[PDB]
Amino acid sequence: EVQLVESGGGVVQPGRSLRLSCGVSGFTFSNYAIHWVRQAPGKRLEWVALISYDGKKQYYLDSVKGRFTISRDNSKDMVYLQMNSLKAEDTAIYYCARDRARSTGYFGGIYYYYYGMDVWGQGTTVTVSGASTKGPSVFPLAPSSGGTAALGCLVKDYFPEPVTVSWNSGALTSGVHTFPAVLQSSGLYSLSSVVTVPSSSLGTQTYICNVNHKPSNTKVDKRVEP
Amino acid sequence: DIQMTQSPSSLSASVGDRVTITCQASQDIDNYLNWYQQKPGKAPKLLIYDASNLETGVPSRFSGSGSGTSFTLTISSLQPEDIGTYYCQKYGSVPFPFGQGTKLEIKRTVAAPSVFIFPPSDEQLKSGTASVVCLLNNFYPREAKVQWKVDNALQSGNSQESVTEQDSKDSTYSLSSTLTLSKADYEKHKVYACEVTHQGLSSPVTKSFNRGE
């Protein structure tokens, strides 16, 4: 029920800026500190920023100390991360996360403990590149009565990551295998999403992949038929 | 400046086996250590806090132990639902350092893959390209060889592979191989084949199709 959701993300070239957002729903936002933590494709989890449950930015990672600024609004349940002077080292997936420590009663001033994050958001991908965003072409992977049939969609030549793929508008989930994207020599990602269905259904059921590539506002529906 | 050293980096075990991952702090940190579970596809999840107390939802098979400079996460009966990467971290203070992580996977009974082959689409062929796709579905172990053949000529380097993370439903992997040629190079040849060697296979299985047939 307690959830955090990140927005923003996409390409931004080295040197310039983007602003990440995080909206929450399910808990009392006013009495929890918020973290920004990132994950680079080949690197471990890396904590980035921290703002108190009120107004205190108790921390930035030393490598972003003057570049990033973390903000908050307890009236709108919102936490932001302004990223300026971005570099390739900033390329990662960014999550906003709630600190496990609550608040309790005043007496003295507020206290600021930090028990170190319990609930995370889905994350948003930030790519720092001088390369141009490209929307994917979506091609069918069709089969050719008994056995188990396999269907698919080839999501080819797109940048940057990620893309999402659903089947029959979220109705078909069982038997779906969406593969991790592959970096072609062209510097463009390519991906396939398959699904194994009974062959008998090939003349009855309709099979459609839904490909979403947010950074280029791409949304394609593709009908896969034998 | 405190460093967290996790070990091992990767780890594999059968279902119901005991599994131990350890975190090491460069200096005494008492009990300020959390464990996080990042399942394939999903964001990390808090499991253990204060080194030994598990979060409300986590199952009995998880336990935390140790103190000061040495900490241990233990799964007493490994389940495929526990597939993912595990992180330790020292909370309480900046910069909340994490360990490099431990990838955990399931040892399973050997499973032969279901192989499929897909010819390029007409739409793509109009663009001047051709992608032929070989699908290896639901197999174990992860080690599998895919060999593209174009008229029995062996291909190498002109293809790209991708393997799914271990599925928790059946502890299997899936693989997708893409062979990309120009439409011109493509329409010069007739038989396109993918040949698969795998431990669950008695002998290489080939899936092929004829261009235009």
Author numbering:
A (entry chain H): 1 to 144, 149 to 230
B (entry chain L): 1 to 213
Extract from the study:
In this paper we demonstrate that late (6–8 year) boosting of RV144 vaccinees with ALVAC-HIV and AIDSVAX gp120 B/E increased the VH chain gene mutation frequency and expanded clonal lineages of CD4bs antibodies with long HCDR3 regions. The epitopes of the vaccine-induced CD4bs mAbs described here appear to overlap those of other CD4bs antibodies and that of bnAb B12 in particular.
Abs DH576 and DH576.2 shared with the CD4bs bnAb B12 sensitivity to 3 CD4bs-critical mutations (D368R, R419G, T455E) and 2 of 3 additional mutation sensitivities (K282V and I467K) suggesting these vaccine-induced CD4bs mAbs have a specificity more similar to that of B12 than to that of the non-bnAb CD4bs mAb, B6 which is not sensitive to D368R, R419G and T455E mutations. The most heavily mutated member of the long HCDR3 CD4bs DH576 B cell clonal lineage was DH576.2 (VH nucleotide mutations of 10.33%), but the additional mutations did not broaden or strengthen HIV-1 tier 2 CRF01 AE.CNE8 neutralization with respect to neutralization by less mutated lineage members such as DH576 (VH mutations of 7.33%). We analyzed by negative stain electron microscopy (EM) a CH505 SOSIP.664 trimer bound with DH576. A 3D reconstruction showed DH576 bound to an open trimer—that is, to Env in a conformation related to the one stabilized by CD4 binding. The bnAbs CH103, CH235, CH31, VRC01, and PGV04, as well as CD4 itself, project away from the center of the trimer, avoiding interference with adjacent gp120 subunits in the closed trimer conformation, whereas DH576 may require the open form in order to avoid overlap. The DH576 Fab has an orientation with respect to Env quite similar to that of the B12 Fab, but turned by ~90° about its long axis. The CD4bs bnAb B12 interaction with gp120 depends upon an aromatic residue at the apex of the HCDR3 loop, aromatic residues around the base of the HCDR3 region, a tyrosine at the apex of the HCDR2 loop and positively charged amino acids in the LCDR1. An alignment of the DH576 inferred UCA and naturally occurring clonal lineage members with the B12 heavy sequence showed that, like B12, the DH576 clonal lineage contained an aromatic residue at the apex of the HCDR3 loop, aromatic residues around the base of the HCDR3 and a tyrosine in the HCDR2 loop. The HCDR3s of B12 and DH576 protrude at different angles and when DH576 is superimposed on the B12-gp120 complex, the HCDR3 of DH576 sterically clashes with gp120.
